[PDB]
């Protein structure tokens, strides 16, 4: 394309493309599938978590994790960068709580995580974060599902998917998604969305799902995931 | 798409960090190999030894280090980077104990090392030191733990694993073994590790050309098995096989 | 004392679905009064007032800095700062300079944007929030102000008689206060009504 | 004939000199008496400035895509020989076609006729025309939405 | 091959040369010519002013400037580097007077200016390239009249008579031919003006030259139009 | 490859990128300046704007102080930055020493600013040229001109920008003591010198006038129309 | 090649990186603004209207910088957010220092100085966002300014940035009456130009957002028109278009 | 190649070509050897007097870093001097910090730390010289370690570094070092140096020794004149016997 | 080459650094100087250049603290920087210890200082070769220091362009040293410089610089007429 305008994050290509940011987005796309649904009474995030072998103990490193009693986060991309971002998001939420005696609004948390990504994607000697985050929160009385991208841009998604088969997940959700939904059906919808592009049997211990309702964000236990997989199946 | 290879922070058009991939290639450069396996209430690490001379001091030559009073590690890859990473891990563990008051969990130490490696990968200041570091320890609640610190910040926990030149074959043998009766005794897990090494290197080991470290729930102190103990285990297992 | 230098007096109570925050008007340096229209009550929102009282320089500086940060907060969020969040903000302000404080005693009074429930609190010069269900005072003659407010306050109050209560309490407190008091301004905040009044006071 | 190049081992010297001969013929000595020239091109910016010189090209006509009125007229022109059916709005078809070239309009007519042929028919209707528009203007967009939303 | 060894001031070429410094020395030439002459009666500086167009009032082309009341600096090169080095020289002379309550020697002040010019790429001072300017400090001190030449490379050397600028090579031979150790100030002035007329584009007439003198006595003096015409009458 | 670096020398000894900054200056609307006996005037071409565009936000003449004015030619953002810093330093010098800034002092400071920005490698030169016209505290119609390379000279009348060469030649030919004897002949000369580049003469001309111990005054368009009418009448009469 | 850095001058004296940013602004979602003696207004199109996106924020391109001032962004999202927060900070700093709202010209000057600093210093890419400011102040009533990536600002009666800016500005020049435009006429003209510039079927009320700043009772008010009012305005405009078509028939 | 420039970029094989070039550079200088006898350690080096103008003792390649540790260098002598200064400074810090003499193993670990820190970055070059540390103490026996540009600290009974290292190692392997005493291991070292030295290529030559052991009270120091003379006489006699 | 000599921080694929070699070559770009010592005297003799017959000869011998002098061969900038460093170090040593700084320690410090730039890409190597002639309690010392941070203790050495002839002369005549009066010592040095000079020219009082230190003799520099007592008695070829 514009080859020479591809090794620098501080130089504009003639058409104006940020080639390095686009390549980071491609790296995000080439990652584990993840899906998010905004139910009318909550939010649900799911993400494909196949191991490369039985040796990998599928209980040490998570993919969907909390950031506060009412906010949680899942990722698609590189796991180390994801760990960095989740740590920074936890720190930002704690700073917000210290300054204001009130849990951080999900919109504010997403804004500041996007600001962190912006900070990392503006200098010529740093690598833009190679992940995209899906942040689910239960601020006020309504749910929130946001996406944050390496470019520092964030969105409010009704329901979306990202990763290897993001296009197929998006079409599937476009077909299956109705606004007047419930969290219980949203869980099944997300699980089916994963299964659509999933390879191999969907054992309860190789899929991770996290709900976010009025009771606060919570990663569903393997027993609950098994029960849900039986219910859909 | 070939110019996106001389820097750590440049993304390839397909979104690949060829420099970190080359760091893994350097992991597969020390020649040596190592294996770790956790039993019902104990974990054991065994690594190939290479002392191609009578002049070298085998006492100093090693690849096992006690990161603290209850956690051990086996290195593989460049030896200088290995020692540097070992010292960094020791410092992190001591700092953790000083700051919080209880010894660092093995997963925590592995995570901190992974975070340091990821920082090096992201900020173009140092090359990602190319050593793969396997930790073993005893957690008061979850039992034995084994973890890896590959030079990209990924730190998944394991039941049993291998690192080095023959990691793929060792992994295949270990998964074959673990698919049946994953719960093993101390002797059983030591035998599994040693036989994995022997078969994958297509050779049997004299007591001097092998190192073994062990942690047990009964004795949760990283202990290096002596020549006598390793020879006894070797002979007993070979006889009873 | 440092507070006694510029004097001052501020008080706030809450009745039923309404609040009443008032303060005295004076600026005298030590004894020589300078002016009689010193704005000791600042509106941070539609139904949220702050009654800074203390050293005049600190009062004005804190008012301006608080307005700065609160405008940033509103513009960045999109909401109107809830009274509890305002209390947290002012506490953080005061405690950010613990080693050398702003010699002032903030007193926040307002109505919740959503439930329109009365809220009142007062802080110390280091930022120790102290929420109350009945009333708060701050500034010089805080002793007489305590006496007045506790004696003449009653629960489940009603706007007009609440205004009468605040007027009488502040008037007598400033009357017994030497340094402070050259006129009393009272603000009554309702669910849908703000009323500002200029109670008659002994100009002496 | 396009923007000339520094003649080296990787330069089309023969084509360049033929273009120079064309330049000379268009405007040199013994100017042409009654020989008008109508040159056509798709991208003009690369044409040598010598060609674009007024005198060699005394006029330059642009052919922008139709303004929906040219589109309606082109639909009429290419559907005159088409067994239409009452209750048909070629105007609405034109609006459904934004920024479409005349070739695209002709393809729209051809595909509507193809759809009619599909059912061994001689008809044409709004349904067939709309489907033909959708088929002919198959825009291959980008769907990551992140590369799309980079620019607020 | 001389395209990779001169991208930086701190890169050595195979011949062990600082090509960037040499390049600045070459840049010295673009300026107008200046000639300084030392004599037992003092020192004389004469510079070919190079007015690019009339309507430029002459009191902006500062090729000769005053350093304290006992030295004059003649410049050839970039005006920016000229200004920076002149400011340094003035500040150093005043600092030395303030500290030691005396007048700095011409050698010492030239050494200070050279010390400033030394810092090429040292990450301890902020200039990063050579000062493309050559200076001639002619002054009077306890050691009698003296004249020094300083070049961009920080090298300074005493010169009983020297010429720099565009007409450097052509004027050096003329100075060599016409120089005998003992002269007078008037004789040096006449010789310098003759050489300037020899190596000047324009006809030497009143303006287009500047003439200055430092003598064991009266301070540094700039000859005005009257004296310039008087000398030009019988150069 | 002897280019694209502020701190790299070429065989001829040039700083090609500061030269390029000067070339960038050359691509700006013409600005003339002249000095009189008691009046100093700055004329500038307007280039006109689309009717939808407001005019008060476009400035080529800016007062750096009571007794100093600045005409501009080059990049507009660099102009704004340089003018802001020049005003800041004028007031700072007034603070440091209780005497109004002299034109020579302020132009030297602007030249030093440009020099500082062109010394290093991580900075781009201020691609502008400026004319500073003012009255020293003793009373004198001083006019200096500063270039991107940090070099400043003193002139009696000069033009910078697109028509720099032609307008400078015209001023060269038609600048005389009798031509600046009074405080109206100077203005007539300024409009005469600008008319060789501007078209309307009144719709594409802005004049600023500084009189001794008097604040800057921008001439009204009607006054410019009257003046250009006077010059036209003089030309036809001389014909 | 004279374009590898933002601090490099081409032999012609051109900042190629700055020019690239200016050109790339052409990809931003169309925005435009009109000034009227009654008030000032902005209109802006939503580039992406996918049905799976929420409307959590009641504005995507238009932000409120302070009590008396609003601005529309057009460019890269990250730079737009950075500059919006920075503008809020600048305005509130001026308010803290002087106890009066910053004049719009002063705020524009500050942000444009920062933009120029970015174009001029070291290894930092120029802020690739154009901005349209509207504001009210006691010095010049209502004002509308337009700021470029290169830190250059101009005061305009009515203008447009982003997609199809050329066509939009041509229509504005053709139709805009110099000094006899009211708010209703300005809104009608804005809807008309947006319809003729988007070129995306009909101008859906959901694919556009409009904001209006007007002085009321001595206090400025910036209203973001609701979906109902946008629907009413587009319906009125299409009624006028139908009337014109019928008359022409 | 492309990946050799700078020491912060891995080649596709995973090899740090800059450190490999540092190893190559160190394997181009004069040879040094050390041996750990049962109750001490001995260093020898074949210094090359590049010109007779140099006096005896110039270019001392057997530094002492803290009283009890000797350090024999091989490679770039500038980097050798810098590393010697760093080693002295680290030993001084350790003595100040802990009030007791620095163990040689710990000192070697710290210097390997320093060398690896240098080889990590991209604004500095890897150390272009290797060296050997040796010491003897009552509470620690005799210790010897070898550090190279990559910064590894393997222990040793003996080692050779420089041009002729493999031949020196081969000669050393056939010795009873674990039981031999200082007074004879010194003679063996001199014999080995004279055997491995290349006269037909290096022309000039000088033999430099040192030891630290109990007979020195655990304090490193240079050889006395008579001891060095006797050792070199024995080496010459052994060389003549081999030639016979 | 052509890609391994663009900076001092990169190793060539031969185990050699090319910038250091380039500096060690630049050192040979200067005028010839030599130094030597007796049992009680250290001396340096050098050929001070003349850029032109009009301009005087640039100074050669630099007077470090009274018991030390140096002769430079290389960039004037690096020579001045190193001379200032020497003077500051000797002043600091005299200020802290009430006695002169040893020449060995001085040269060690100089070697470390010149080595540090030879590793980090922050400045070029110090392009000067230094002959340090000093007198400490131990006795007269002559040291050489090169841009590669290598320093030698030399009994009689030469540096600069055309140093091979002087080195050969010193090699031949070294047997004489240690038992020569000061006059004989300076005559030896002058003969070495005559040999290194080409035949058709010679040594004149104008262009030769001499520096001597020794017992109860602080460093003294002779130039111009001052060297007449040596040249006049010096034998002719």
Describe this structure in words.
The structure is cut from a larger assembly and holds nine protein chains of nine kinds. By secondary structure, chain A is α+β, with helices and mostly antiparallel strands. In chain A, 36% of the residues lie in helices and 23% in strands. In chain A, the strands form two sheets. Chain A has a five-stranded antiparallel sheet with strand order 8-1-2-9-10. In chain A, strands 3-4-5-6-7 form a five-stranded antiparallel sheet. In chain A, strand 9 and strand 10 form a beta hairpin. In chain A, helix 4 runs antiparallel to helix 5. Chain A is globular, with a radius of gyration of 18 Å. Chain E has one domain: Aminohydrolase, N-terminal nucleophile (Ntn) domain (Glutamine Phosphoribosylpyrophosphate, subunit 1, domain 1, 4-Layer Sandwich). Chain E contains six helices and ten strands. In chain E, the strands form two sheets. A five-stranded antiparallel sheet of chain E has the order 8-1-2-9-10. In chain E, helix 2 crosses helix 3 and helix 4 runs antiparallel to helix 5. Chain E is globular. By secondary structure, chain F is an alpha+beta fold. In chain F, helix 2 crosses helix 3 and helix 5 packs across helix 6. The radius of gyration of chain F is 18 Å and the shape is globular. With 249 residues, chain G is α+β, with helices and mostly antiparallel strands. Chain G has a single domain, classed as Aminohydrolase, N-terminal nucleophile (Ntn) domain (Glutamine Phosphoribosylpyrophosphate, subunit 1, domain 1, 4-Layer Sandwich), CATH 3.60.20. In chain G, strands 8-1-2-9-10 form a five-stranded antiparallel sheet. In chain G, strands 3-4-5-6-7 form a five-stranded antiparallel sheet. In chain G, helix 4 runs antiparallel to helix 5 and helix 5 crosses helix 6. Chains in contact: A-B, A-C, A-D, A-G, B-H, C-G, D-G, E-F, E-I, F-G, H-I.
């Amino acid at each position: 394309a514009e080859r020479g305008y591809s090794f620098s994050l501080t130089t504009f290509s003639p058409s104006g493309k940020l080639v390095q940011i686009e390549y980071a987005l491609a790296a995000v796309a080439g990652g584990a599938p993840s899906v998010g649904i905004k139910a009318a009474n909550g939010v649900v995030l799911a993400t494909e978590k196949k191991q490369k072998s039985i040796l990998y103990d599928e209980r040490s490193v998570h993919k969907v994790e909390p950031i506060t009693k009412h906010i949680g986060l899942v990722y698609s991309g590189m796991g180390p960068d994801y760990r960095v971002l989740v740590h920074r998001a936890r720190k930002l939420a704690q700073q917000y709580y210290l300054v204001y005696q009130e849990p951080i609004p999900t919109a504010q948390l997403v804004q500041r995580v996007a600001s962190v990504m912006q900070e990392y994607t503006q200098s010529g000697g740093v690598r833009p974060f190679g992940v995209s985050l899906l942040i689910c929160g239960w601020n006020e009385g309504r749910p929130y599902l946001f996406q944050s991208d390496p470019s520092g841009a964030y969105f409010a998604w009704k329901a979306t998917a990202m990763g290897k088969n993001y296009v197929n997940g998006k079409t599937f959700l476009e077909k299956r998604y109705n606004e007047d939904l419930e969290l219980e059906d949203a869980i099944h919808t997300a699980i089916l969305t994963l299964k659509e592009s999933f390879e191999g049997q969907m054992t309860e211990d190789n899929i991770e799902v996290g709900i976010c309702n009025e009771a606060g964000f919570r990663r569903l236990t393997p027993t609950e995931v098994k029960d849900y997989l039986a219910a859909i199946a | 798409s070939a110019g996106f290879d001389r820097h750590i922070t440049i993304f390839s058009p397909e979104g690949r960090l060829y420099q970190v991939e080359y760091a893994f290639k350097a992991i597969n450069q020390g020649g040596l190999t190592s294996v770790a396996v956790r039993g019902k209430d104990c974990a054991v690490i065994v690594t190939q030894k290479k002392v191609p001379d009578k002049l070298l001091d085998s006492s100093t030559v090693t690849h096992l280090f006690k990161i603290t009073e209850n956690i051990g590690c086996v290195m593989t890859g460049m030896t200088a980077d290995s020692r540097s990473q070992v010292q960094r891990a020791r410092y992190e563990a001591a700092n953790w104990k000083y700051k919080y008051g209880y010894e660092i969990p093995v997963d925590m130490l592995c995570k901190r090392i992974a975070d340091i490696s990821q920082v090096y990968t992201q900020n173009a200041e140092m090359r990602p030191l190319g050593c793969c570091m396997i930790l073993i320890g005893i957690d008061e609640e979850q039992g034995p733990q084994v973890y890896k610190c590959d030079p990209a910040g990924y730190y998944c926990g394991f039941k049993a694993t291998a690192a080095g030149v023959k990691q793929t074959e060792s992994t295949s043998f270990l998964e074959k073994k673990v698919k049946k009766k994953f719960d093993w005794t101390f002797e059983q897990t030591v035998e599994t590790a040693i036989t994995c090494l022997s078969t994958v290197l297509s050779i049997d080991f004299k007591p001097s050309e092998i190192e073994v470290g062990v942690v047990t729930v009964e004795n949760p102190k990283f202990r290096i098995l002596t020549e006598a103990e390793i020879d006894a285990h070797l002979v007993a297992l070979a006889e009873r096989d | 004392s440092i507070m006694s230098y510029n004097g001052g007096a501020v008080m706030a109570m809450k009745g039923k679905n309404c609040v009443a925050i008032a303060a005295d008007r004076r600026f005298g340096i030590q004894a020589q009064m300078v002016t009689t229209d010193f704005q000791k009550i600042f509106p941070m929102g539609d139904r949220l007032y702050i009654g800074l009282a203390g050293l005049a320089t600190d009062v004005q500086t804190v008012a301006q800095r608080l307005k700065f940060r609160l405008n940033l907060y509103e513009l960045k969020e999109g909401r109107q700062i809830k009274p509890y969040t305002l209390m947290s903000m002012v506490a953080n302000l005061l405690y950010e300079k613990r080693f050398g404080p702003y010699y002032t005693e903030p007193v926040i009074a307002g109505l919740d944007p959503k439930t329109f429930k009365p809220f009142i609190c007062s802080l110390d010069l280091i930022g120790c929030p102290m929420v109350t269900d009945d009333f708060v005072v701050s500034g010089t003659c805080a002793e007489q102000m305590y006496g007045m407010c506790e004696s003449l306050w009653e629960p489940n109050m009603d706007p007009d008689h609440l205004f009468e209560t605040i007027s009488q309490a502040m008037l007598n407190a400033v009357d017994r206060d030497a340094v402070s008091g050259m006129g009393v301004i009272v603000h009554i905040i309702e669910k849908d009504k703000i009323t500002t009044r200029t109670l008659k006071a002994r100009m002496d | 004939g396009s923007s000339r190049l520094e003649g080296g081992s990787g330069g089309d010297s023969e084509v360049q000199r033929t273009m120079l001969e064309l330049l000379n013929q268009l405007d040199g000595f013994e100017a042409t008496k009654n020989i008008k020239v109508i040159m056509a091109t798709n991208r003009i910016d690369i044409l040598d400035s010598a060609l674009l010189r007024p005198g060699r090209i005394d006029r330059k006509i642009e052919f922008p895509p139709p303004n929906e009125e040219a589109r309606l007229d082109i639909l009429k022109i290419h559907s005159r020989k088409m067994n239409l059916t009452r209750g048909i709005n070629l105007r609405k078809i034109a609006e459904l076609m934004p920024g479409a070239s005349g070739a695209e309009v002709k393809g729209v007519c051809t595909e509507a006729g193809m759809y009619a042929l599909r059912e061994r028919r001689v008809h044409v209707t709004q349904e067939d025309f709309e489907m033909a528009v959708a088929k002919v203007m198959q825009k291959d967009s980008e769907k990551n939405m992140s590369i799309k939303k980079l620019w607020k | 091959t001389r395209s990779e060894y001169d991208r930086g001031v701190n890169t050595f070429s195979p011949e062990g040369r600082l090509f960037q410094v040499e390049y600045a020395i070459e840049a010295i030439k673009l300026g107008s010519t200046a000639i300084g002459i030392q004599t037992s009666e003092g020192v004389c500086l004469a510079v070919e002013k190079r007015i690019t167009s009339p309507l430029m009032e002459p009191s902006s082309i500062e090729k000769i400037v005053e350093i304290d009341a006992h030295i004059g600096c003649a410049m050839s090169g970039l005006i920016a580097d000229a200004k920076t080095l002149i400011d340094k020289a003035r500040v150093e002379t005043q600092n030395h007077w303030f500290t030691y309550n005396e007048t700095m020697t011409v050698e010492s002040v030239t050494q200070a200016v050279s010390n400033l010019a030394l810092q090429f790429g040292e990450e301890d001072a902020a200039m990063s390239r050579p000062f493309g300017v050559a200076l001639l400090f002619g002054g009077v001190d306890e050691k009698g009249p003296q004249l020094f030449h300083m070049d961009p490379s920080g090298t300074f050397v005493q010169c009983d008579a020297r010429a720099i600028g565009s007409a450097s090579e052509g004027a050096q031979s003329s100075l060599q031919e016409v120089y005998h150790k003992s002269m007078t100030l008037k004789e040096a002035i006449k010789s310098s003006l003759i050489i300037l007329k020899q190596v000047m584009e324009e006809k030497l007439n009143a303006t287009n030259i500047e003439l200055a003198t430092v003598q064991p006595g009266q301070n540094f003096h700039m000859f005005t139009k009257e004296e310039l015409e008087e000398v030009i009458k019988d150069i | 490859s002897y280019d694209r670096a502020i701190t790299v020398f070429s065989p001829d000894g040039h700083l090609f990128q500061v030269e390029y900054a000067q070339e960038a200056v050359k691509k700006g609307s013409t600005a003339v300046g002249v000095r009189g006996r008691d009046i100093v005037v700055l004329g500038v071409e307007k280039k006109s704007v689309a009717k939808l565009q407001d005019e008060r936000t476009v400035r080529k003449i800016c007062a750096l102080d009571d007794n100093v004015c600045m005409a501009f030619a080059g990049l507009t953002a660099d102009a704004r930055i340089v003018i802001n810093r020049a005003r800041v330093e004028c007031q700072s010098h007034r603070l440091t020493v209780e005497d109004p800034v002299t034109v020579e002092y302020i132009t030297r400071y602007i030249a030093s600013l440009k020099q500082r920005y062109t010394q290093s490698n991580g900075r781009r030169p201020f691609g502008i040229s400026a004319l500073i016209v003012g009255f020293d505290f003793d009373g004198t119609p001083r006019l200096y001109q500063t270039d991107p390379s940090g070099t400043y000279h003193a002139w009696k009348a000069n033009a910078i920008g697109r028509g720099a060469k032609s307008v400078r030649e015209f001023l060269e030919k038609n600048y005389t003591d009798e031509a600046i004897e009074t405080d109206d002949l100077t203005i007539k000369l300024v409009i005469k010198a600008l008319l060789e580049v501007v078209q309307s003469g009144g719709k594409n001309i802005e004049l600023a006038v500084m009189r001794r111990d008097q604040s800057l005054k921008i001439l009204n368009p009607e006054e410019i129309e009257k003046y250009v009418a006077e010059i036209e009448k003089e030309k036809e009469e001389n014909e | 090649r004279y374009d590898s850095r933002t601090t490099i001058f081409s032999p012609e004296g051109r900042l190629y990186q700055v020019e690239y940013a200016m050109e790339a602004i052409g990809h931003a979602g169309t925005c435009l603004g009109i000034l009227a003696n009654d008030g000032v207004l902005l209109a802006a199109e939503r580039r992406n209207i996918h049905k799976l996106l929420d409307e959590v924020f009641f504005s995507e391109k238009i932000y409120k910088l302070n009590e008396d001032m609003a601005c529309s962004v057009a460019g890269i999202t990250s730079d737009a957010n950075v500059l919006t927060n920075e503008l809020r900070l600048i305005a509130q700093r001026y308010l803290l220092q002087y106890q009066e709202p910053i004049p719009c010209e002063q705020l524009v000057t500050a942000l444009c100085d920062i933009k120029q600093a970015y174009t001029q210093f070291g290894g930092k890419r120029p802020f690739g966002v154009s901005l349209l400011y509207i504001g009210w102040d006691k010095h010049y009533g209502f004002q509308l300014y337009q700021s470029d990536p290169s830190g250059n600002y101009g005061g305009w009666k009515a203008t447009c940035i982003g997609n199809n800016s050329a066509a939009a500005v041509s229509m504005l020049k053709q139709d805009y009456k110099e000094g006899e435009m009211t708010l209703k006429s300005a809104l009608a003209l804005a809807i008309k130009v947006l319809n003729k510039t988007m070129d995306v079927s009909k101008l859906s009320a959901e694919k556009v957002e409009i904001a209006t700043l007007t002085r009321e009772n001595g206090k400025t008010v910036i209203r973001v028109l609701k979906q109902k009012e946008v629907e009413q305005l587009i319906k009125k405009h299409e009624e006028e278009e139908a009337k014109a078509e019928r008359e022409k028939k | 190649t492309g990946y050799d420039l700078s020491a912060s970029t891995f080649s596709p094989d995973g090899r740090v070509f800059q450190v490999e070039y540092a190893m190559k550079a160190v394997e181009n200088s004069s040879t040094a050897i050390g041996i750990r006898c049962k109750d001490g350690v001995v260093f020898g080096v074949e210094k090359l007097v590049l010109s007779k103008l140099y006096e005896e003792g110039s270019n001392k390649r057997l530094f002492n870093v803290d009283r009890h540790v000797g350090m024999a260098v091989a490679g770039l002598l500038a980097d050798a001097r810098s590393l010697a200064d760093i080693a002295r400074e680290e030993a001084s810090n350790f003595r100040s910090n802990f009030g007791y003499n620095i163990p040689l193993k710990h000192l070697a670990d710290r210097v390997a730390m320093y060398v690896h820190a240098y080889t990590l970055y991209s604004a500095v070059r890897p150390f272009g010289c290797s060296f050997m540390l040796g010491s003897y103490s009552v509470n620690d026996g005799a210790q010897l370690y070898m550090i190279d540009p990559s910064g590894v600290s393997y222990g040793y009974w003996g080692c050779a570094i420089g041009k002729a290292r493999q031949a020196a190692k081969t000669e050393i392997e056939k010795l009873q070092m674990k039981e031999m005493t200082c007074r004879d291991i010194v003679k063996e070292v001199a014999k080995i140096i004279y055997i491995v030295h290349d006269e037909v290529k290096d022309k000039a030559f000088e033999l430099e020794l040192s030891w630290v052991g109990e007979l020195t009270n655990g304090r490193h120091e240079i050889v006395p004149k008579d001891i060095r003379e006797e050792a070199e006489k024995y080496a010459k006699e052994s060389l003549k016997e081999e030639d016979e | 080459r052509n890609q391994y000599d663009n900076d001092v921080t990169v190793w060539s694929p031969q185990g050699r650094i090319h910038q250091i070699e380039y500096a060690m070559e630049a050192v040979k770009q200067g005028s010839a100087t030599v130094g030597l010592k007796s049992k009680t005297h250290a001396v340096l003799v050098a050929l001070k250049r003349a850029q032109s017959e009009l301009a005087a000869h640039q100074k050669k011998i630099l007077h470090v603290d009274n018991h030390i002098g140096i002769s430079i061969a290389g960039l004037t900038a690096d020579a001045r920087l190193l001379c200032n460093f020497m003077r500051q170090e000797c002043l600091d040593s005299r200020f802290v210890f009430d006695r002169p700084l040893p020449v060995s320690r001085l040269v060690s410090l100089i070697g470390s200082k010149t080595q540090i730039p030879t590793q980090r890409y922050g400045r070029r190597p110090y392009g000067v070769g230094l002959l340090i002639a000093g007198y400490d309690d131990m006795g007269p010392h002559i040291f050489q220091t090169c841009p590669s941070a290598n320093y030698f203790d030399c009994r009689a050495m030469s540096i600069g362009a055309r140093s091979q002839s002087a080195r050969t002369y010193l090699e031949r005549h070294m047997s004489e040293f240690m038992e020569c009066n000061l006059n004989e010592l300076v005559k030896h040095g002058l003969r070495a410089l005559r040999e290194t000079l080409p035949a058709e020219q010679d040594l004149t009082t104008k262009n030769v610089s001499i520096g001597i230190v020794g017992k109860d003799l602080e460093f003294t520099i002779y130039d111009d007429d001052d060297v007449s007592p040596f040249l006049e008695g010096l034998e002719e070829r």
